[PDB]
Short mmCIF file of C-alpha atoms in Angstrom, two decimals:
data_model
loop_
_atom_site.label_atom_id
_atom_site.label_comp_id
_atom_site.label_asym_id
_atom_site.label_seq_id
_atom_site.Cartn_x
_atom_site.Cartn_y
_atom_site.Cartn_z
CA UNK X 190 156.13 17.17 143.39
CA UNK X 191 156.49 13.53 143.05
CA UNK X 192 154.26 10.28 142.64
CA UNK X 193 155.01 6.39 143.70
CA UNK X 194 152.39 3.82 142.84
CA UNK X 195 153.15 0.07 143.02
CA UNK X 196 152.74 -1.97 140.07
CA UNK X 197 151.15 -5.69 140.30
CA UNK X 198 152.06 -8.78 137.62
CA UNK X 199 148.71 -9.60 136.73
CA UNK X 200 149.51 -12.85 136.55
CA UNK X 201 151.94 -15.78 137.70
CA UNK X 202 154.25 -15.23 134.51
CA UNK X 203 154.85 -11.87 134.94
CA UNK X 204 153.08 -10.91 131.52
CA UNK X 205 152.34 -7.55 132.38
CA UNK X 206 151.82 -5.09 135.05
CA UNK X 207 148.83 -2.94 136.54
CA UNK X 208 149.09 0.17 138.08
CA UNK X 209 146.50 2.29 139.45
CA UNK X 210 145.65 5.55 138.48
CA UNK X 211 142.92 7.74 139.77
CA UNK X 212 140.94 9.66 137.01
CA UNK X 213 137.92 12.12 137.66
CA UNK X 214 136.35 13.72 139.82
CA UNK X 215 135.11 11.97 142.76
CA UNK X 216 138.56 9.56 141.98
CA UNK X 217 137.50 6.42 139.05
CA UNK X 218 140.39 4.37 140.46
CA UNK X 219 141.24 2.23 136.93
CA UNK X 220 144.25 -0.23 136.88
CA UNK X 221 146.55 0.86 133.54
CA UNK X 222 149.72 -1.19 132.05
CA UNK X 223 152.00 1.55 132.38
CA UNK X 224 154.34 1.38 128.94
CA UNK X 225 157.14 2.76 127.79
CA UNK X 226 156.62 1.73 124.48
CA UNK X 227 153.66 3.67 123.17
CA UNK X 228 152.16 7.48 124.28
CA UNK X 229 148.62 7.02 124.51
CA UNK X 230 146.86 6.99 127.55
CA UNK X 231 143.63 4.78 126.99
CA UNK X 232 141.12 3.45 128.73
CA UNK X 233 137.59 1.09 128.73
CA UNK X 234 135.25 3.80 129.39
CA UNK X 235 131.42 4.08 128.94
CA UNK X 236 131.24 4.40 125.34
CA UNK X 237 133.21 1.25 124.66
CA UNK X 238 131.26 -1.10 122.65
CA UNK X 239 129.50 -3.42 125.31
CA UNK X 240 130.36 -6.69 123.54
CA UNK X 241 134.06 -5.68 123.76
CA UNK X 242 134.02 -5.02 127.59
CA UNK X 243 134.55 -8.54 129.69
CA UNK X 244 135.37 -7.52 133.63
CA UNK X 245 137.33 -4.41 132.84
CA UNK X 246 136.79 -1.40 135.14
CA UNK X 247 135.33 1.58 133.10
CA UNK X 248 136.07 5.73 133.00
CA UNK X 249 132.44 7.04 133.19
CA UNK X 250 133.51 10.50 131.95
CA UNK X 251 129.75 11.50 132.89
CA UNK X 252 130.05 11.09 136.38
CA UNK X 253 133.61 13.20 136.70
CA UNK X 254 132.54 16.96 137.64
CA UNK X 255 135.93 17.48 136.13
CA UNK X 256 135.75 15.91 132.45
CA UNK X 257 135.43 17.70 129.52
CA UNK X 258 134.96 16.56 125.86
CA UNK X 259 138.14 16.89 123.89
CA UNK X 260 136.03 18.21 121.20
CA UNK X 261 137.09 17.05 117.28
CA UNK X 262 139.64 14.91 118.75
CA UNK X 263 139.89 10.65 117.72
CA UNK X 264 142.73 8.77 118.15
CA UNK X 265 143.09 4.99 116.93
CA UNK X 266 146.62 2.71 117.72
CA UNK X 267 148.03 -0.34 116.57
CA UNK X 268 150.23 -1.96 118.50
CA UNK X 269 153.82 -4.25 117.44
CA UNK X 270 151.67 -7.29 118.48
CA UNK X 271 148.93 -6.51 116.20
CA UNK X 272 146.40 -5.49 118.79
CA UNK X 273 144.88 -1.90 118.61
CA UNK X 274 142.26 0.53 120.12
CA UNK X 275 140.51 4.01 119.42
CA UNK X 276 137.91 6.27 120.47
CA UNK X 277 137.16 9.82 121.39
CA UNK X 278 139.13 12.06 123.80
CA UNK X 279 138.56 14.07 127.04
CA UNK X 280 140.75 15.61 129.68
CA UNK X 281 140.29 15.11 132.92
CA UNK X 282 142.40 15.24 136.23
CA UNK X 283 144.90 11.98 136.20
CA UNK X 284 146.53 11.10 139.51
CA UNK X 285 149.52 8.82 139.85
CA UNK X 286 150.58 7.59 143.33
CA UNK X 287 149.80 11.10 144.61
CA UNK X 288 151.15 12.84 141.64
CA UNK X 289 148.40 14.80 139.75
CA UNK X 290 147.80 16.23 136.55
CA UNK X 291 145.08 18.86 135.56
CA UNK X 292 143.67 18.23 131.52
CA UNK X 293 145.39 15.23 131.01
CA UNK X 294 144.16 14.04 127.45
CA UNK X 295 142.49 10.54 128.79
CA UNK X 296 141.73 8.39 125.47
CA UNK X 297 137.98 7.01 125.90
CA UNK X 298 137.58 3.61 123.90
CA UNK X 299 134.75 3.04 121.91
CA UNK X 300 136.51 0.18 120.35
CA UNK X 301 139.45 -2.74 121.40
CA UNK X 302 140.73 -5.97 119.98
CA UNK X 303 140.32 -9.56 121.12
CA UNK X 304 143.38 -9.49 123.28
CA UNK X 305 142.37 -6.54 125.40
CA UNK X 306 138.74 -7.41 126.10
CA UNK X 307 140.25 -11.01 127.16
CA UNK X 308 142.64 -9.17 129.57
CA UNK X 309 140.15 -8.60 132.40
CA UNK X 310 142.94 -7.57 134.71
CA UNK X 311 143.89 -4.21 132.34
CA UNK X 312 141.51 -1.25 132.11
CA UNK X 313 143.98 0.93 130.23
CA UNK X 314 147.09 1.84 129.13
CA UNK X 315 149.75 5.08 130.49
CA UNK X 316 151.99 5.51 127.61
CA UNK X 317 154.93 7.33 129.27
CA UNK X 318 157.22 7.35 125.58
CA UNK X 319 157.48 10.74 124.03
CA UNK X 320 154.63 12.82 123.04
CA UNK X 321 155.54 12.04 119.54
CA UNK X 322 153.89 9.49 119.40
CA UNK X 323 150.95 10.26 120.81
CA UNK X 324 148.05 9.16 117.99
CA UNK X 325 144.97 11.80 118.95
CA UNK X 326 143.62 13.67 115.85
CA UNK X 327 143.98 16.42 114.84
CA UNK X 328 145.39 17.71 117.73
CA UNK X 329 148.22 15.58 119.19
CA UNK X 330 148.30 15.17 123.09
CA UNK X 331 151.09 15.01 126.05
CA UNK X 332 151.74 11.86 127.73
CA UNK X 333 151.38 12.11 131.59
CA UNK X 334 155.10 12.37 132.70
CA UNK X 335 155.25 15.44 129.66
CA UNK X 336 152.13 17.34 131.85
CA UNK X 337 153.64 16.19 135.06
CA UNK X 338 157.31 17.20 134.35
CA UNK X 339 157.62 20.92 134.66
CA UNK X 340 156.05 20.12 138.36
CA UNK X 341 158.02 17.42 139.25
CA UNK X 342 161.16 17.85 141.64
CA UNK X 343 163.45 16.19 139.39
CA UNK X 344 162.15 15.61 135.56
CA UNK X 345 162.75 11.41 135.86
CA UNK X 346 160.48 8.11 136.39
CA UNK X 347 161.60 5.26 137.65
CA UNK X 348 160.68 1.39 137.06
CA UNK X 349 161.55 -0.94 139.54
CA UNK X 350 159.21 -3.93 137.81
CA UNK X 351 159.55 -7.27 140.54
CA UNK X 352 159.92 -11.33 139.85
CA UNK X 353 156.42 -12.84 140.36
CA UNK X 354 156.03 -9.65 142.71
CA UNK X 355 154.61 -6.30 143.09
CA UNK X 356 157.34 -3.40 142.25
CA UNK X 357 157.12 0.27 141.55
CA UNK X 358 157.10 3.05 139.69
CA UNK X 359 158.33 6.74 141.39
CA UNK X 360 158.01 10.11 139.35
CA UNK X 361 160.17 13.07 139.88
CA UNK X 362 162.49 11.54 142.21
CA UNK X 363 164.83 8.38 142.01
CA UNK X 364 164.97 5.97 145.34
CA UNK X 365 168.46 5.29 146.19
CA UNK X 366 167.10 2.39 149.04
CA UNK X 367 165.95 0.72 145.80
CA UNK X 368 168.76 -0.32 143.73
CA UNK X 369 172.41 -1.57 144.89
CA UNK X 370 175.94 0.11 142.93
CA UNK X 371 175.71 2.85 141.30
CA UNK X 372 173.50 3.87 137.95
CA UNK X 373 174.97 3.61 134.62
CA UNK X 374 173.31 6.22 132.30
CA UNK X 375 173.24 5.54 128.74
CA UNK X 376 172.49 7.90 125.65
CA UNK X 377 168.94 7.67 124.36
CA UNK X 378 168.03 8.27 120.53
CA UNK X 379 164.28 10.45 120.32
CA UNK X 380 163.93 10.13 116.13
CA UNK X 381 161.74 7.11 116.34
CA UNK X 382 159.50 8.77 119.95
CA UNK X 383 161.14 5.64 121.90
CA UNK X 384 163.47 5.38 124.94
CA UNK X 385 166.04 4.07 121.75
CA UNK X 386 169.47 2.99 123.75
CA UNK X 387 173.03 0.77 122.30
CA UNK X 388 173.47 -2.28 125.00
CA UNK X 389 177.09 -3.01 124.85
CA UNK X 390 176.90 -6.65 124.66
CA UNK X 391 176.05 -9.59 125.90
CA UNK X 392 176.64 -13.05 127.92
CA UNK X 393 175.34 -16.57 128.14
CA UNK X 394 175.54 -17.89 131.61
CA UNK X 395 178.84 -17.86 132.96
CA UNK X 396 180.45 -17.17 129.48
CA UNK X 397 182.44 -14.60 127.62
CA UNK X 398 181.14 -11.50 127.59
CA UNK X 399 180.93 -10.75 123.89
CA UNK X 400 181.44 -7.08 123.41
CA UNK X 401 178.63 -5.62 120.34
CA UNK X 402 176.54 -2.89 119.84
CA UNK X 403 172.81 -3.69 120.03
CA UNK X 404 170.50 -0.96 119.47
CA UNK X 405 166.72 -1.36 121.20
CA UNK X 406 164.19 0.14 122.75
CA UNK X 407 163.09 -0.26 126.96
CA UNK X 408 159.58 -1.12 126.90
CA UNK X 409 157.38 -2.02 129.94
CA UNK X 410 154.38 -3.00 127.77
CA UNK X 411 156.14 -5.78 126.09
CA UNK X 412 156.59 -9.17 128.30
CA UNK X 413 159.99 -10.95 126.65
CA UNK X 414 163.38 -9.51 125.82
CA UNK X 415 163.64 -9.37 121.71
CA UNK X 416 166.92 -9.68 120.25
CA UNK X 417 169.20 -10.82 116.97
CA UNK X 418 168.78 -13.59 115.85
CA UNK X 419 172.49 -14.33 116.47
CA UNK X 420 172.24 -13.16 120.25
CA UNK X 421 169.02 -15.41 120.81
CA UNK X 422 170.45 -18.64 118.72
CA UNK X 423 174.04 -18.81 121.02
CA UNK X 424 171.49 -18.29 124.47
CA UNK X 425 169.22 -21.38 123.11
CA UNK X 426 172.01 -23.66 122.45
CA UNK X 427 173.21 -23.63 125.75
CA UNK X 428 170.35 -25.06 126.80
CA UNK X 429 169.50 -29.01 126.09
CA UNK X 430 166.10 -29.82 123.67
CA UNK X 431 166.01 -25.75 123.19
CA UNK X 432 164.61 -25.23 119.92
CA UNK X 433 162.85 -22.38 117.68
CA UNK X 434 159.17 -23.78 116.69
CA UNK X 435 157.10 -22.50 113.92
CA UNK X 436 154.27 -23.70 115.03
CA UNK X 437 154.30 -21.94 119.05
CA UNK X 438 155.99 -18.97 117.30
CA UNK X 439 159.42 -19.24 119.09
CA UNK X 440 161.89 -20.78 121.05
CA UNK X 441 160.46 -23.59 123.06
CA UNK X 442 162.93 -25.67 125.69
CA UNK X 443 161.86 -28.58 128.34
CA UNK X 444 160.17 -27.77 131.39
CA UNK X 445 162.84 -30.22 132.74
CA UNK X 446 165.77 -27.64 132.18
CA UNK X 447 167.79 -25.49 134.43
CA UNK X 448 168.27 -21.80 131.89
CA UNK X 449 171.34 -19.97 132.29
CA UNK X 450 171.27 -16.32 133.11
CA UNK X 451 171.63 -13.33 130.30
CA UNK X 452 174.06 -10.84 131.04
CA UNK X 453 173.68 -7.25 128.87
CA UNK X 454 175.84 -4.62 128.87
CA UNK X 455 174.78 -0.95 129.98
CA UNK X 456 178.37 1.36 128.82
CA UNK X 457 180.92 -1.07 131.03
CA UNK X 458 178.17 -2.11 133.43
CA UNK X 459 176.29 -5.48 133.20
CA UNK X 460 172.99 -6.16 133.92
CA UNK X 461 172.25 -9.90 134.86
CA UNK X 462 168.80 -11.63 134.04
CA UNK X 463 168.89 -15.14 136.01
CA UNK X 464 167.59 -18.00 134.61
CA UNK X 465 164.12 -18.40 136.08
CA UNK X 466 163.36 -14.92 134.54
CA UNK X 467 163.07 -16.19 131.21
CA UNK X 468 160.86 -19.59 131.66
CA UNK X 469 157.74 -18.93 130.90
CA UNK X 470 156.13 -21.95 131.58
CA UNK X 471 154.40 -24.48 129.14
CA UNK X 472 153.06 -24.04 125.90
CA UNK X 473 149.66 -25.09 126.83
CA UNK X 474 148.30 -25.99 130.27
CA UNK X 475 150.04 -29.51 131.49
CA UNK X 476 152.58 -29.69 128.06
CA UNK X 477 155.91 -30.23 128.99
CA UNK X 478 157.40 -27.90 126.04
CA UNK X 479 158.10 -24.43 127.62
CA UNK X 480 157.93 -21.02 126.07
CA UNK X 481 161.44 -18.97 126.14
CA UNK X 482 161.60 -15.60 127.58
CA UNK X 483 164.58 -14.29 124.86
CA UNK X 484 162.81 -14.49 121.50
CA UNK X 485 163.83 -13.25 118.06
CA UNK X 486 163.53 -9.60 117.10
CA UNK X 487 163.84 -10.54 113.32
CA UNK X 488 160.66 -9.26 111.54
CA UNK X 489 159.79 -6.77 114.86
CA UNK X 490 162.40 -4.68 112.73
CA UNK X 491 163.42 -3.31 116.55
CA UNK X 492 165.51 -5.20 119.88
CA UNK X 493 162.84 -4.40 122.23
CA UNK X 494 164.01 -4.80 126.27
CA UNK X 495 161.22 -6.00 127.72
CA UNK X 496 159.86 -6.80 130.99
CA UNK X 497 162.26 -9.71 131.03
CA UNK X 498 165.28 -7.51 130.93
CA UNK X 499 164.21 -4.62 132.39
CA UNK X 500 162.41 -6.58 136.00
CA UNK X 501 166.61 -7.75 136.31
CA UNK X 502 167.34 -4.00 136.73
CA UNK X 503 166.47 -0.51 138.32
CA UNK X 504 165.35 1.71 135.72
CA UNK X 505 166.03 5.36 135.16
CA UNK X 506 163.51 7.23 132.47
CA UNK X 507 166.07 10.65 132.95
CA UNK X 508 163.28 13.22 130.03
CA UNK X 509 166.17 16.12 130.81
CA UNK X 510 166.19 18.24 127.51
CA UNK X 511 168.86 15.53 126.55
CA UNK X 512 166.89 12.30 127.70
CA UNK X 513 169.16 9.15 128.80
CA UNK X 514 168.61 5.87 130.06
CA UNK X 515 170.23 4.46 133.44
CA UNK X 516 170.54 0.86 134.84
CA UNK X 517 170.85 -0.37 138.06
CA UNK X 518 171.10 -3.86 139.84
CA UNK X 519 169.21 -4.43 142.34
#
């Protein structure tokens, strides 16, 4: 089998991406932020508190002939941006771009944080990182793509995430129309339940390429690309009035500058992010000062490859018994 369901910015910066996914029995049709960053699959349901719930879509788990009570089970998440979610647990049938799954664990909120009830445009979250993970109590759960693998023609997703434009994401099969080159696969680490991979460097606009190992993680539920301090100060400096404010929380530049690209290395391949990838636009509506799309990763404690790196490429999630990474341009 395979699946392919296109995935939608939700906004004009690119700040994340909604998918949908059809869950129950006749089809709730919910739009998730698919992530490769966390392994819950979560969404605003019928039992989440009512003050919490502003536009979202909701699971009604009452109305699916198919749902069943995950009985005993909880499950509660905190996030790397300090937001967080938990509730009770049933399984249900989960459908992907025509790509199903019988007893999928689907996470019911009862409770969310500020940021999530603010994001009307989300109604979940697909956590496709390994099952590791996975936070329900006291019986931990498999992520979709785990259920879906055995079934799937080839055991691989694929995220193809687009500039200010709708992309995609294909299960069990990788799209060679999609991408231009070849695809330069990459070892992945498993110990910390990420897609953990070494970029082989880096460069600033039309510089050097500056050959060093940077260890991160590839994860569609975070917006920016997070990196050393040292990697994110040489990008900045090439650009005039760039600067790292306390106050905003980051690098800040003038609306009036023309970035630079950001070249990273995938083995002897090179992935290039242009310039316009990483403004994200002012500080505040009409200000002048604009937010930087390569940020600091001191204090995160991780790199993390965000949507800003990873909507420059062609993405392959390979979960073979020896998972890898591979990178395309596109």
């Amino acid at each position: 089998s395979t699946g392919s369901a296109t995935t939608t910015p939700i906004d004009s910066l690119d700040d994340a991406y909604i998918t949908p996914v059809q869950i129950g029995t006749p089809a709730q049709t919910l739009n998730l932020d698919f992530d490769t960053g966390s392994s819950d699959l979560w969404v605003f349901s019928s039992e989440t508190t009512a003050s919490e719930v502003d536009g979202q879509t909701i699971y009604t788990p009452s109305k699916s002939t198919t749902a069943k009570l995950l009985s005993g089970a909880t499950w509660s998440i905190s996030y790397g941006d300090g937001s967080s979610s938990s509730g009770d647990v049933y399984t249900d049938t989960v459908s992907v771009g025509g790509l199903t799954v019988t007893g999928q664990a689907v996470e019911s909120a009862k409770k969310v944080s500020s940021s999530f009830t603010e994001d009307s445009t989300i109604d979940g979250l697909l956590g496709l990182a390994f099952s590791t993970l996975n936070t329900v109590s006291p019986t931990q759960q498999k992520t979709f793509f785990d259920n879906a693998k055995a079934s799937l023609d080839s055991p691989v997703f694929t995220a193809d995430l687009g500039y200010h434009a709708p992309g995609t994401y294909n299960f069990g099969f990788i799209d060679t129309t999609a991408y231009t080159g070849s695809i330069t696969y990459t070892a992945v680490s498993t110990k910390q339940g990420f897609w953990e991979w070494t970029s082989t460097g880096y460069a600033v606009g039309s510089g050097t390429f500056k050959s060093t190992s940077i260890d991160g993680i590839a994860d569609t539920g975070t917006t920016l690309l997070y990196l050393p301090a040292t990697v994110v100060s040489a990008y900045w400096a090439q650009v005039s009035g760039a600067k790292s404010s306390s106050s905003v929380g980051g690098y800040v530049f003038p609306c009036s500058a023309t970035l630079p690209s950001f070249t990273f290395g995938v083995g002897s391949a090179r992935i290039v992010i242009p310039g316009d990838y990483i403004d994200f636009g002012p500080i505040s509506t009409g200000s002048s000062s604009c937010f930087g799309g390569i940020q600091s990763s001191a204090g995160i404690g991780i790199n993390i490859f965000g949507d800003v790196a990873l909507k420059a490429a062609f993405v392959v999630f390979n979960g073979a018994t020896t998972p890898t990474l591979g990178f395309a341009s596109k």
